[PDB]
Design a protein around this ligand. Structure first.
Ligand SMILES: CCOC(=O)c1ccccc1S(=O)(=O)NC(=O)Nc1nc(Cl)cc(OC)n1
Ligand SMILES: CCOC(=O)c1ccccc1S(=O)(=O)NC(=O)Nc1nc(Cl)cc(OC)n1
Lengths: 349, 349
């Protein structure tokens, strides 16, 4: 249903730091002008929204959007059906949704001058990068080429404009500062579960190594693998003989071992090939990336962990894209998330 | 009272257009690359959130943040008290909150290359501008100089960092394209009331002249005045005898006359000086800007309109900043908005 009853809701800012321009502020001179004189700027802060049900049961959930996205992807699907925010408030969890630093209602650090530049210091790069509709189409596995859909597709076809409009650029904020803001949120909230997506996968793993309050991770289609420092296994190049997946993130073993203390599930949708696919770069990228993640989870398990890989087709769900939580069967995807939380008692007080 | 019962909630993207890079897309090639080759980019779209109560009464309200802000300002106050979104859902109105193009979850049009540049075309300027903590302090009339409060201030003291963290830059998207997005939303919604703030004041007036569905406007501390073309009255410079207020927006009389067909209220807080204040630029700016608005409302009334100026101190509310709807007495401010809606029948079906 669409009905939701909230004991309370709201939003707040957390994290970040300040930087300044030179000189002193004079309230008698024109305030609106091209200058950083006497100016203090808040940068790299994060936006957080929360919705709490009446009588919550179990741990709060923190939904962390993927690369170039915002908390919108947890609010509604492109065709207007309820997102995981509504579904999990109905499932009696308090739900936090974030816009990480650099995205959406999070801070974009720019000043008076060329983008990202505060006098002679470059806070973020002036040159940006960004995905396109065509690139996102194949990245998210709607189909093998733009305009084409896989046979089984759970994408909300007809709502392509709504979907692609939710995506945008990210300034070059360091990943350390993004992780820092979420660590501060986790400290503020208490024991919780991180639910991550694509680019935020590796970031949530890092947060968990810095914050014991992270009691579980569910990562949809994580984009970068993580390994103990020096211990990255052999990972093959892509079928084009030339490209590689994202360089795996390496952390000190004492931090990596903290991942063995909590339940971790990685979730993949459909249409990731089992064999090399030289004609379709992003399908082959997903094949090797998923392979790397299987090795990462094995390394966590070998250290005593509780890490698992869930392929949605093996659970009877066919046709999911890389955004299973906004696909047409997102209610069944949510059911599998509820199952994970129930298995580990994360839905009990 | 923090509880809210929602018949439905969600979010969506509306408006915008597309721009394209050179050439064609090949799915065999590396997709993550420094290139706009074959790229279609969605630009200048707007984010929209809605919450609908059970059995709504009257017209939906569209809350439109001021300059450099987002829909956060209607969700919560900096100290975590309920914003107008919650208060007006409780008051039985469906509530829309937007992040306009270029702000928050709205689109920031940038690509692969220097900020805002698509190959040789400048979609928005690479050089940005932004407010500082110090400039915003005096702009919002927390006090006469940064760090100092008016004795009577309604600002939630102690939550300064939270407040200033909600503010940011806006890329140089044309005002025409911002107005266009909101006109499209109003067409989608049907009859509605615009609630604007500061920079969005003039934009909401423009929307109403294009969209008969706007049935009322309440503008908090509007920043730019509006007049019929060629009929701008004499407006003095500031007390420094150098500076001017924002050049008034001029529109054809045929469009201006549409403003006389709906109830319009401009709402101002406290601590705007009656007399020239050369020592405090932004206090003097507000004095002359409020004067210009008084003449704008007079012009609407001479065309048969019903346009009023509400100074909160005359209603018994003292110390309000330029964000009365997040101040400590925001419940009393909300009551005055409910009074306006009820008097004009905008709270009945
Ligand atoms: C659902 C959001 O997708 C992701 O998080 C994601 C997934 C796989 C690989 C990279 C990313 S990413 O965002 O961290 N990075 C990109 O998607 N970058 C990127 N994507 C495309 Cl399609 C083109 C491009 O060109 C610069 N750059
Ligand atoms: C409450 C949000 O405030 C407004 O909407 C507002 C109000 C009055 C004047 C200008 C703006 S504005 O945003 O459209 N513009 C600015 O506030 N710009 C701005 N403010 C400051 Cl204090 C400094 C500055 O330097 C470029 N530039």
């Amino acid at each position: 249903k669409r009905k939701v009853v909230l004991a309370e809701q709201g939003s707040f800012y957390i994290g970040g730091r300040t930087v300044t321009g030179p000189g002193k502020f004079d309230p008698s001179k024109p305030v609106i002008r091209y200058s950083n004189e006497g100016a203090t700027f808040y940068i790299n802060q994060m936006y957080v929204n929360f919705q709490a049900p009446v009588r919550p049961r179990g741990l709060p959930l923190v939904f962390w959007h993927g690369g170039g996205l915002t908390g919108h992807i947890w609010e509604s699907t492109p065709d207007g059906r309820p997102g995981f925010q509504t579904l999990f408030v109905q499932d009696r969890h308090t739900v936090y949704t974030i816009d990480q630093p650099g995205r959406g209602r999070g801070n974009i650090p720019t000043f008076n001058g060329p983008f990202g530049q505060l006098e002679e210091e470059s806070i973020v790069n002036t040159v940006t990068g960004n995905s396109s509709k065509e690139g996102a189409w194949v990245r998210d596995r709607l189909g093998p080429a733009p305009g084409q859909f896989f046979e089984n597709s759970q994408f909300p076809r007809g709502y392509e404009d709504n979907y692609f409009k939710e995506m945008g650029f990210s300034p070059s904020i360091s990943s350390d500062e993004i992780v820092d803001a979420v660590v501060k949120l986790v400290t503020h909230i208490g024991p919780c579960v991180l639910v991550t997506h694509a680019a935020s996968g590796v970031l949530g793993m890092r947060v968990a190594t810095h914050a014991k309050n992270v009691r579980g991770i569910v990562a949809y289609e994580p984009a970068t693998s993580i390994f103990p420092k020096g211990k990255v296994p052999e990972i093959p190049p892509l079928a084009d003989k030339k490209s590689q997946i994202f360089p795996p993130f390496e952390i000190q073993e004492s931090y990596f071992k903290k991942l063995a203390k909590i339940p971790i599930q990685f979730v993949f949708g459909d249409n990731i090939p089992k064999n090399p696919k030289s004609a379709y770069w992003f399908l082959d990228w997903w094949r090797v990336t998923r392979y790397a993640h299987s090795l990462s989870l094995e390394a966590i398990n070998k250290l005593g962990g509780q890490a698992s890989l869930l392929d949605l087709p093996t659970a009877g769900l066919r046709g999911n894209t890389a955004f299973p939580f906004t696909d047409r069967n997102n209610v069944q995807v949510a059911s599998l998330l509820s199952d994970f939380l129930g298995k580990h008692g994360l839905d009990q007080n």
